[PDB]
# Entry
Amino acid sequence: ITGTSTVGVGRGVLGDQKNINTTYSTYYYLQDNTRGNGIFTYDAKYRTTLPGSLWADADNQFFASYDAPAVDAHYYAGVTYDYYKNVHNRLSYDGNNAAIRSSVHYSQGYNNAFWNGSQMVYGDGDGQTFIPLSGGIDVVAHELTHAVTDYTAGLIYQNESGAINEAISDIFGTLVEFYANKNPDWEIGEDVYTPGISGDSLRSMSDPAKYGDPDHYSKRYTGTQDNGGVHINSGIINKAAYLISQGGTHYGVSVVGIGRDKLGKIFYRALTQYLTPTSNFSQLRAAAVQSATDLYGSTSQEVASVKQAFDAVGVK
Ligand SMILES: O[C@@H]1[C@@H](O)[C@H](O)OC[C@H]1O
Ligand SMILES: O[C@@H]1[C@@H](O)[C@H](O)OC[C@H]1O
Ligand SMILES: O[C@@H]1[C@@H](O)[C@H](O)OC[C@H]1O
Ligand SMILES: O[C@@H]1[C@@H](O)[C@H](O)OC[C@H]1O
Ligand SMILES: O[C@@H]1[C@@H](O)[C@H](O)OC[C@H]1O
Ligand SMILES: O[C@@H]1[C@@H](O)[C@H](O)OC[C@H]1O
Ligand SMILES: O[C@@H]1[C@@H](O)[C@H](O)OC[C@H]1O
Ligand SMILES: O[C@@H]1[C@@H](O)[C@H](O)OC[C@H]1O
Ligand SMILES: [Ca+2]
Ligand SMILES: [Ca+2]
Ligand SMILES: [Ca+2]
Ligand SMILES: [Zn+2]
Ligand SMILES: [Zn+2]
Ligand SMILES: [Zn+2]
Ligand SMILES: [Zn+2]
# Structure
């Protein structure tokens, strides 16, 4: 809509206050004109028609329970935009400042959130398995990173390529969570998963085995469920990424940690320059090594640590 750029205030799913960029024309709309071609957040009104109505509010105050998923979808889309622009010089998910559109209150009791090829879609959860999923910045950034992948390498969504696709989204979801630096960790979805249970998450990058996911290539899932285990086998790559950043000794292999920023630069360059739709784990290792070589030199600690981490998870 056409209007004046304003700044509202509200509370997110977890009860935290934040400012949101809005547009004023009779109503205040969740339309952020400060980022690219805009960030737009919509009310799906418990239906499955998309996108729904551009979110309209009478007073630019967003403290109602019903407002909270929209506040967070809108704000965390902005954080994700800021991460990719400030850290990687990437303008929105397509690198050409595409508008970021999000719909909340999608369906009823819907325990999922997804990038659908042109927008984000957030269920409210059933209140037991999940609370509204836009409350998780790593979920928001994980899903927006699928769009980044779609517009670059084009990794399919099955078998090893699909597990890489998933891991890339977990890696940058986590790096966005650290970039926002409110309550970061190496877990996925902890803020919105199982409100009755503290200390759990959907999966752990630091210790995938905590939830039964593999932390070594020899433990990879080879069945047909989950498109060949894309959310399971991602643990092998997630563990490698965790090791590259934080270091550690894993199955007897010592990894010197190089920190989060270099992890992100290495994997971002691998994704955008070297991966292809059918890249497998071994080809991801090669891409990460070449990326670290480009950025830091063949004799660098960064290259050596990439090799150590992939050795530690059994990917040659
Ligand atoms: O409403 C306006 C928006 O549509 C435009 O894109 O940039 C400025 C805004 O105030
Ligand atoms: O506690 C939260 C509240 O602060 C917000 O206003 O609406 C959603 C709730 O989860
Ligand atoms: O924590 C990371 C920070 O150290 C780096 O500068 O950019 C990415 C962030 O996630
Ligand atoms: O998961 C924890 C991780 O976040 C931290 O980096 O090191 C200790 C781990 O237990
Ligand atoms: O020890 C873990 C176990 O607690 C869990 O039930 O399944 C995976 C294992 O890694
Ligand atoms: O063969 C692998 C071994 O090299 C490593 O130490 O731990 C897992 C095994 O599968
Ligand atoms: O069965 C597949 C296996 O061969 C591969 O290594 O990892 C993904 C699985 O789907
Ligand atoms: O196969 C790819 C190779 O061509 C390149 O050099 O680095 C990435 C690899 O995965
Ligand atoms: Ca209001
Ligand atoms: Ca997390
Ligand atoms: Ca929980
Ligand atoms: Zn998803
Ligand atoms: Zn995913
Ligand atoms: Zn967290
Ligand atoms: Zn998924």
Residues 190 and 201 are 4 Å apart (CA to CA). The pocket of zinc ion (ligand 13) is lined by residues 142, 146, 166, 169 (CB under 6 Å). The radius of gyration is 19 Å.
